[PDB]
Design a protein around this ligand. Structure first.
Ligand code: NA
Ligand code: NA
Ligand code: NA
Ligand SMILES: [Zn+2]
Ligand SMILES: [Zn+2]
Ligand SMILES: [Zn+2]
Length: 187
């Protein structure tokens, strides 16, 4: 999409006022999405971790890698979103549901940076998909997503709000691996 404005870029970097946060519809995440965890597993994220580790004098390669290892770990390799339905692929198995939007929650991290979780819930008694999901993607108002983090669970939304360490990360499926690493190198 368009280059971000200064304000949007500050928002993407966790600086924004709560009054500027707006609701978003599920279609912002429409598409087919690939988990980045297999890139980590195959060693393809080594140069990202090397770059980050070289830049940060306070962190070693291992600490950076462990951080993203804990972050990206998931068995959900693919997520498809269309027509109000989210479908989750785990090995050869699929689940799906027509998710109902439930608003957003603004979180403040220890650093004082902030982030917005967009909440959805599955109320279809026949579905085996996660009852609760939350999207977080460095965007606080309607805009098609470039990559997203998703929190998935069956217990409560607060349970997912409490999750800070694991944030399964998804990029558009149409991107080649080189393209994904290229984007990651710039973050
Ligand atoms: Na299902
Ligand atoms: Na799941
Ligand atoms: Na992130
Ligand atoms: Zn370092
Ligand atoms: Zn991200
Ligand atoms: Zn992106």
């Amino acid at each position: 999409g368009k280059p971000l404005t200064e304000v949007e870029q500050k928002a993407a970097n966790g600086v924004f006022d709560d009054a500027n946060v707006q609701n978003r519809t599920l279609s912002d995440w429409d598409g087919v999405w690939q988990s980045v965890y297999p890139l980590l597993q195959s060693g393809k994220l080594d140069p990202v971790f090397q770059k980050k580790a070289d830049a940060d004098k306070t962190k070693t390669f291992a600490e950076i890698k462990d951080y993203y290892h804990k972050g990206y770990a998931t068995d959900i390799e693919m997520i498809g979103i269309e027509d109000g339905i989210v479908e989750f692929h785990r090995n050869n198995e699929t689940t799906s549901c027509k998710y109902d939007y439930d608003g957003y929650k603004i979180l403040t991290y220890k650093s004082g940076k902030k982030g917005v979780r967009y909440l959805f819930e599955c109320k279809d008694p026949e579905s085996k998909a996660p009852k609760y999901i939350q999207f977080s993607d460095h965007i606080i108002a309607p805009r098609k997503s470039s990559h997203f983090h998703i929190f998935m669970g069956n217990d409560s939304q607060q349970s997912l709000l409490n999750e800070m360490e694991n944030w399964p990360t998804y990029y558009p499926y149409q991107l080649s691996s080189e393209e994904v690493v290229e984007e990651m190198m710039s973050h």
